[PDB]
Amino acid sequence: HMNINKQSPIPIYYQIMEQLKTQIKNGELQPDMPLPSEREYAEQFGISRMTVRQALSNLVNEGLLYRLKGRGTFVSKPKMEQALQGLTSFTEDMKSRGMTPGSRLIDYQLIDSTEELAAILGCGHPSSIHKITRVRLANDIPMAIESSHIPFELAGELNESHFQSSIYDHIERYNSIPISRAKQELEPSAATTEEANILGIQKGAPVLLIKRTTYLQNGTAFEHAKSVYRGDRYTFVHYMDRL
């Protein structure tokens, strides 16, 4: 049950919205069962129903809750289906979903090649390697953290405008060769404290750890990326044939 502090400067409706949000983040409210009623909340904390109703309606207007007639109010659990077999960019993914892709830069460095990285990319050593770490956003909501390693010569000099747009698009134009094939490795994990803060989920929340090596049509590897995708807003789908 929530913790409501009436002597706090923070308005009670706001407390409710945040506690509820926090409760949805740590799973204490699942999407199969309805929330306590307006009346139950009010009586529980000795507060007005209109205060409860203000918090709940705001959460409905955010799309965090929904009202099913005669059944109650429920936690919304929108999932995107990520097709694993089609090589696409984040930008392409969002557009196809009628959503607006965004990025926030966590870190950029141009780093020295290592024998490990050069063997993965089949690039030169010593060489310079873009290391691009971004939060990827969908309608301003963080969906993933990606850290992409790209040999300098396959991208040339990069600036903030590149980071704010599509790296795959730049890659195809800069190289005049299409992006063709990738290998991905998937591991379930728990969000670190840092990953959780950036993603707006709980410490330890479920995430998919993804390692991708991406290739141009001519067989050249241009990317080795490691990423963390939110478990709570993604389902990953693929198909299998016999033989």
Ligand X SMILES: CC(=O)N[C@@H]1[C@@H](O)[C@H](O)[C@@H](COP(=O)(O)O)O[C@@H]1O
The entry of a copy of itself, ligand X, none that residue 34 binds, CB within 5 to 8 Å by partner kind? none
115 known member of a binding site: no
DSSP secondary structure letter of residue 34: P
In the bound complex, what is the minimum distance in angstroms from residue 207's beta carbon to a copy of itself? 6
Query: Which of 29/138 has CB closer to ligand X?
Result: 138
The entry of a copy of itself, ligand X, none that residue 42 binds, CB within 5 to 8 Å by partner kind? none
Binding residue (CB under 8 A) for a copy of itself from 62, 112, 185, 194: 185
Q: How far apart are the first and last CA of the chain?
A: 52
- From CA 40, how far away is CA 134, in angstroms rounded? 43
Residue 127, token pair as written in the block: 């060489």
The entry of ligand X, a copy of itself, none that residue 227 binds, CB within 5 to 8 Å by partner kind? ligand X
The entry of a copy of itself, ligand X, none that residue 91 binds, CB within 5 to 8 Å by partner kind? ligand X
53 known member of a binding site: no
Residues making contact with ligand X (CB under 6 A): 89-91, 101, 146, 148, 166-169, 210, 212, 225, 227
108 known member of a binding site: no
174 known member of a binding site: no
Any long-range contacts for 82-88 (C-beta under 8 Å, 24+ apart)?
Answer: 82/229, 82/234, 82/235, 82/236, 82/237, 83/237, 83/238, 84/184, 84/236, 84/237, 84/238, 85/238, 85/239, 87/179, 87/180, 87/181, 87/182, 87/214
90 known member of a binding site: yes
- Pick from 148, 146, 136: which is nearest to 110 by CA? 148
When asked if residue 207 is in the footprint of a copy of itself (CB under 8 A), the reply is yes
Binding-site residue numbers for N-acetyl-D-glucosamine 6-phosphate are 90-91, 134-136, 146, 166-168, 223, 229
